[PDB]
Assembly symmetry: C3
Homo-oligomer: 336 residues x 3
């Protein structure tokens, strides 16, 4: 399309919602290509990531870790207004893995505090894709400070399986998985800082060990458990988008499966089926489609169980409905 042609396209302004929720959208595309507009402010904020009061200087797209999921369709234009507020201390930018050229938008979106930019890219490829901050000289530091999220580029005709049967989700959740590298003192205590810059040297030392101190969902230990558990009902079709901008993960729905899993996150690559545990490399997002069959609490985990139950990479689903004794039954309950 020409510049004049793009300028003629319908503009639709989208209002983002916080992970793990996803803003309103249509699975099948509404008419021809549109310029879908989003705005996010990059917020620098202290976050507490565990019950010990451990702090991280987070870089939060739209105020969250991870930043929110943006949903467009293949061949829409994603037009992001990105804003760096005056109260911030650092330059920030954005690399969209979905985009083509200028380091994913990174080379065109470098904003100092008090600056804004507007980037437009054509979403030519269907899938779930990571985005992250990537300032030259400080790339992994910003990323492991929570400066990442994802987008979903839906096929204009919605999702399908390998064979062409439509796959339509009733619910969609976005899990952003985060590896943190929090410096400790000589007593094994996590250190605190009064400015993001103050933690830099200490953090880089920990980063180089390639061993995170915490691995969490939605920015904290227990962020997606208890009250903040994701919800479903027996018979509901759920899509779980999962991203990790820096480090590998192996998602697993304990009590469930991934009926269809785009493990690479790309919708033109046919999904794997009947998955127990899938694998998403650092720097990617994946998506799993499941229909719930049993009510109760599920644990959705990074299935390195040390990472899940020692380091924080565990979420819950709360599922309502009738128990199915055909699928599973206790023939003899625990007894002498």
């Amino acid at each position: 399309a020409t510049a004049a042609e793009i300028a003629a396209l319908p503009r639709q302004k989208v209002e983002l919602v916080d992970p793990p929720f996803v803003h309103a959208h249509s699975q099948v595309a509404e008419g021809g290509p549109k310029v879908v507009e989003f705005t996010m402010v990059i917020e620098e904020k202290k976050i507490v990531i565990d019950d010990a009061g451990t702090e991280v200087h987070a870089m939060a797209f739209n105020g969250t870790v991870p930043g929110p999921l943006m949903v467009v369709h293949q061949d829409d234009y994603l037009e992001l207004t990105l804003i760096n507020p005056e109260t911030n201390t650092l330059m920030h930018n954005i690399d969209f893995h979905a985009a083509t050229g200028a380091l994913g938008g990174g080379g065109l979106t470098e904003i100092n505090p008090g600056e804004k930019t507007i980037l437009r890219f054509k979403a030519t490829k269907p899938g779930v894709f990571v985005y992250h901050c990537a300032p030259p000289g400080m790339v992994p530091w910003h990323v492991v400070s929570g400066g990442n999220g994802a987008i979903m580029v839906l096929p204009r005709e919605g999702l399908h399986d390998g064979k062409g049967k439509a796959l339509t989700y009733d619910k969609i959740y976005y899990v952003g998985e985060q590896d943190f590298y929090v410096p400790r003192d000589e007593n094994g205590k996590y250190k605190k800082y009064e400015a993001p810059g103050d933690a830099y040297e200490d953090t880089v030392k920990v980063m180089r060990t390639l061993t995170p101190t915490h691995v969490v969902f939605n920015g904290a230990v227990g962020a997606l458990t208890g009250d903040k558990a994701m919800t479903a009902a027996v018979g509901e079709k759920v899509l779980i988008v999962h991203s990790q901008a820096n480090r590998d993960t192996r998602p697993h729905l304990i009590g469930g499966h991934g009926d269809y899993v785009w493990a690479t996150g790309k919708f033109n690559t046919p999904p794997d089926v009947d998955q127990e545990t899938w694998f998403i490399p650092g720097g990617a997002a994946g998506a799993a489609f499941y229909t719930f069959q049993q009510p109760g609490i599920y644990a959705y985990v990074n299935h390195n169980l040390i990472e899940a139950f020692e380091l924080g990479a565990a979420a819950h689903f709360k599922v309502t409905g009738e128990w199915n004794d055909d699928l599973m039954t206790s023939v003899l309950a625990p007894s002498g």
Copy 2:
């Protein structure tokens, strides 16, 4: 299916065999759906995991690390009797990745010492699947103490390749791979403990490093070597089921290939072909099919070669038969 229909189904009681062997089964299902019955006693026991005599307090399904492979067909019911003897000190349970609901069975199988339980589940999806102990609050500790195994749910029609050709193995082996985290003293020598509980806090410390001290097949360094080497012959078709309940692995047959590899372990997902090295994420089982073409010794390894040759993740095959100079020949043997 109703309770009355299931009650009407035939029962078979299977005798489990120790890994790497697999109990007598048929690849193609004989008859309609059965209720397949297994019994396992969990043993808390001291095991030696290397030639130095390093010991671990293991949690051992059926007394072995890994626990034995259970084999059923799709839409069979698996009915496990699980026994926690009174000589044990901890509660145990079981999560079948093959199963649907109650945390894979974990929520219905919490047994204290002196207790037993019977769990039935419908095997709705064909593939190889991990099972493991998963007691709330102590999940990874039990798993990395050896408390894991696998099952195989064969399609009723046996195995096929991606494209409708039947694949029939002559023999099957199950390689359970285990990451162990053994505390060291101030001179780097492995510590021993009187009771399982004594080791807990030191072991958690090593676990948090995400660096296993040992990575072994069938419970110990070199367990599948010497007169315990796996065997085949030229022309023989071998299925190799491989599981890792906690940590990623990258299986490789040195001198051979994976002709068909269900790297995700799920038989409705078409296998990769002509593989050098496949990838099995932590919390999953995979399976490779190979037809041996050359006689001699092969090493079957996790192809992080440090993990293979320093940490313990190497097995051998001894293969009998005639050498094929077409496939490979020494034109000029090592000479001055």
Copy 3:
């Protein structure tokens, strides 16, 4: 038959250093050939970073990684492997592409002052690791750089899932190396007189499973600056990537993998529209991309700590015209 093999054409090929690849045709020309290669194993000190950090490398053909060898399915690869009397160690070679004798390693154990010639039939199409593998010292030889890759092209060249021909304009080979360099008490990398002096200290670092360096083409920044890879808008590029010991996750920052044989095997259909692909330790993968935008791209292991802190970052410098349909700055950074 014996005569049929004996009668097949023999052809000598000259190797070139990574990231470049020797002359080859994508579509096989004629029937099966015996393609002849020669490599001299060089034990040599190499510098791997900007602080002058040294490794006693084992370098097939004098390079880390060793060079890419290219043949076609059902060709034979016939390698003459030479271990100079000036070397101190025995070496051999395991071809993951080959069948038997531990990939060739059991037939190629050559002491200093020896050579050997190995022939194998390249029965399966794909990119495959090769590495040194002396019994009992396998990982030490591999993490000292003694590894490379080969490509076994389908006789009919590459195809997509629908069997449409994929023809590259150029090919690069990125060999990724995990190094495990000992440090003294003050955190300074140690140096050693002979390779064997470093053995015990090196194995200690190896057991932490934590590399000190993760590099492309044998050194931090080897494929950046005046040594960036190059392309033009519209140009079709195959990037072959190997890691003989440790997982990696390649990502073309600014680009994609249009077709990615993540397993490296050409009979396994490629994944498409890839953001970041995954290559397990002990394998090679291949990605096909058609550049759409000019500029600098970063080609990385997308554990960004490995990429930017440990060395796993390369560049592409791409010429041609910007495409505003694909991407445009609507409002440039402004106060």
